[PDB]
Amino acid sequence: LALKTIDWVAFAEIIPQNQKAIASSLKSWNETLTSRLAALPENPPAIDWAYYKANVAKAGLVDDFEKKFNALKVPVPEDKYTAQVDAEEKEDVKSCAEWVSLS
Amino acid sequence: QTSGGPVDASSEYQQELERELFKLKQMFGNADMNTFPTFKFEDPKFEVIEKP
Amino acid sequence: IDTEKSQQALVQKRHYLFDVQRNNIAMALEVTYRERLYRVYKEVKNRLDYHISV
Numbered sequence: 001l002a003l004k005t006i007d008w009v010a011f012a013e014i015i016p017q018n019q020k021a022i023a024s025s026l027k028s029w030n031e032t033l034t035s036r037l038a039a040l041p042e043n044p045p046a047i048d049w050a051y052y053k054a055n056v057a058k059a060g061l062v063d064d065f066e067k068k069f070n071a072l073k074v075p076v077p078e079d080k081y082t083a084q085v086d087a088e089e090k091e092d093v094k095s096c097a098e099w100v101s102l103s
Numbered sequence: 104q105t106s107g108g109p110v111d112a113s114s115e116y117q118q119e120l121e122r123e124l125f126k127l128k129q130m131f132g133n134a135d136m137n138t139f140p141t142f143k144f145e146d147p148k149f150e151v152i153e154k155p
Numbered sequence: 156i157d158t159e160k161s162q163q164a165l166v167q168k169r170h171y172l173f174d175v176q177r178n179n180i181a182m183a184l185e186v187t188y189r190e191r192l193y194r195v196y197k198e199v200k201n202r203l204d205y206h207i208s209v
Contacts, residue, residue, distance in 0.1 A: 002181060004174035014169050019155065023172075026152075030175065033182040040189055044196035047203060056207055061137070068139045069199055074191045075144050081180050088153045089173040096166045103159050124209060131205040140198045144191055147183050152176050 008027070015023045047069075052062040105111040128136070 001185075003178055006171055006175055006178065010168050011171050011175060013165060014172055016154070022150075026175065026179065030179055030182070033179055033186065036186050037182060040193060042189065044193050047196070047200060052203060052207070056203070058137075058206055061206060062203070065139060065199060065203065069195075072142075072195065074142075074188070074195060076188055077144075077146055077184065079180055079184055081149060082177060085152055085173055085176050085180075089170070092169065092173070096169055100163055100166060103162065127209055128205075131208070132201065136202045136205045140195075140202060142191075142195055142198070145187075147187055 011023075011027070047066070049062065049066055052066075056062045134140075
């Protein structure tokens with residue numbers, strides 16, 4: 001978990017008027033995203049076996065279910081979105097650097 | 104003494120047990136709940152982020 | 156003079172835009188990931204309870 005703390009009026013100070021709304025939308029997303037993170041814990045509670053080992057009289061159903069579950073690996077998706085924003089940040093850094101030198 | 108009687112001579116109550124278990128299923132779901140579940144995994148949407 | 160000095164600190168602050176985007180990225184990622192974890196946890200719990208119920 002790597003989250004960068006942020007101001008927000010400072011954010012508002014650096015939005016060109018042509019694209020306020022999307023930025024604001026972005027902003028909105030953040031907040032609801034944060035809520036959606038606090039809306040559920042990190043890991044689900046793993047289903048025990050003994051409670052089902054001694055109650056599910058079905059043959060092998062609990063067994064093979066638990067096994068295929070342990071044999072299940074959820075696809076943890078990769079971003080492929082951070083590198084491009086990093087590069088855009090780099091270009092913006094170059095631009096503001098030359099601007100501030102000239103100023 | 105029911106090893107010989109799979110229901111021990113009920114001779115009825117099937118006409119209601121059918122509906123009871125049908126409703127129990129159709130409220131629990133509609134798939135083959137006796138098999139292992141399959142899973143499709145969607146992925147989020149995105150957009151242009153840089154200055155247009 | 157100071158107005159240019161003001162413009163200096165302002166552009167200096169510009170880096171907030173990018174990290175906020177980053178923040179939403181890592182956030183939404185774990186969201187869908189954890190959502191998947193609870194989807195799979197719920198669905199197996201459903202079949203498990205279904206059989207023990209009937």
